[PDB]
Design an enzyme around this catalytic site. Sequence first.
Site: not given
Lengths: 213, 213
Positions: B32, B62, B66-67, B69, B173, B179, B193
Amino acid sequence: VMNRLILAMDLMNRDDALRVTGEVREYIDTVKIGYPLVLSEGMDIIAEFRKRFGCRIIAGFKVADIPETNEKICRATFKAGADAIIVHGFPGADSVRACLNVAEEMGREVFLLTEMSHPGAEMFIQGAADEIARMGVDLGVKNYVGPSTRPERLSRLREIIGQDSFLISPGVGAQGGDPGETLRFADAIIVGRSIYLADNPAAAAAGIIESIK
Amino acid sequence: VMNRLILAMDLMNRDDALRVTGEVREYIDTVKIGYPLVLSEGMDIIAEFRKRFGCRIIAGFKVADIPETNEKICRATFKAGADAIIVHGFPGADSVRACLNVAEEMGREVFLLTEMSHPGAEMFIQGAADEIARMGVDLGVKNYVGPSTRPERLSRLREIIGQDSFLISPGVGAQGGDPGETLRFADAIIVGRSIYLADNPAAAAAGIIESIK
Ligand SMILES: O=c1[nH]c(=O)n([C@@H]2O[C@H](COP(=O)(O)O)[C@@H](O)[C@H]2O)cc1F
Ligand SMILES: O=c1[nH]c(=O)n([C@@H]2O[C@H](COP(=O)(O)O)[C@@H](O)[C@H]2O)cc1F
Ligand SMILES: [Cl-]
Ligand SMILES: [Cl-]
């Protein structure tokens, strides 16, 4: 802000973004740059705008991550030259404070986004907007962002933040907001497409200013 | 996802990010990448990761605009090579649909972020999280993000999205999430981290995997 007009430069290639901004440089001294342009051309584009136009740059990133990541995003953004950054208030006070910390450290500004302008904002954001605004007030936030598309909501936001707070508002033009009506409550309006997609950006900007002279 | 482990690579310089990811490449096939790295090194870093590690890349952006953009951000992100993008659900259905449209067009995936893992998430996000999850289900969203730090909330999210949906979870973590406990409900855990800041990233990753054999 010059002419109470902030240009939302969301074109996605440097040539077009710089050309259009140049066309309207005499009407503004503040430009909001967001992810469409930054992700497409790189963060160095912020420094390019500042040097070429001598304008204030507001990074419309609407930071909405956990505190630790928000700090990193703000640091990177201010290091790139942004004078201010827009932060979402919905994620809570700790996420907002993280941004305030970096802004104070680097001598920059934080704008708190309270309610958004699009239809979907009604689902979850609107119901939390007044409390988000109060949260900002309680933390000493002085700059806010509210919706041009909902005049009574923008009016309520102004009541909450007080007359001394600075309020800017997007949704003018393309989204249906009226320049004059919006300025009854906001100190400045954010305008994107109505200007940058216009056949004559300069004429479009001049027309908006004429309507609010 | 290999070993049900997704590395959150939030280091902010190319050399460090690539070096640490290389150290743990044998333990993961999904990374990610978020704004800390992308804003610091540029979006081209996504293609660098894909070619150097042959890994799946989830852009943890995330999206919360607006739609119109949101569509632009998704397009730029997928053009850069991201296999998936994380989208905030709090801005509403239209903003989510905008992302779904681009993802379908380009053959990529959308992960809907329901509730966040940090303390501040309790202020406004938590109260809207179940409805945000239902909104995703009603729109056919199959990938979700929920908090490792609130096991009962993560459990409720799983109940809403069903067993067939894919659920990943951050907050393991550094933020206190466990986990094993998290994997009682999520299909994969996001870890940053605890791995990339560890004295021995490989040992840290191996230890986590060992605890969830
Ligand atoms: O509530 C919001 N509405 C918005 O429109 N925006 C941004 O303002 C700009 C509006 O541009 P327009 O083209 O004038 O609609 C654009 O950058 C949006 O992403 C942000 C917000 F926080
Ligand atoms: O609710 C969330 N919590 C998070 O922690 N994150 C991201 O997951 C990562 C967590 O990394 P950590 O270092 O393991 O805490 C990091 O990139 C965050 O920005 C996103 C979310 F949506
Ligand atoms: Cl913005
Ligand atoms: Cl993320």
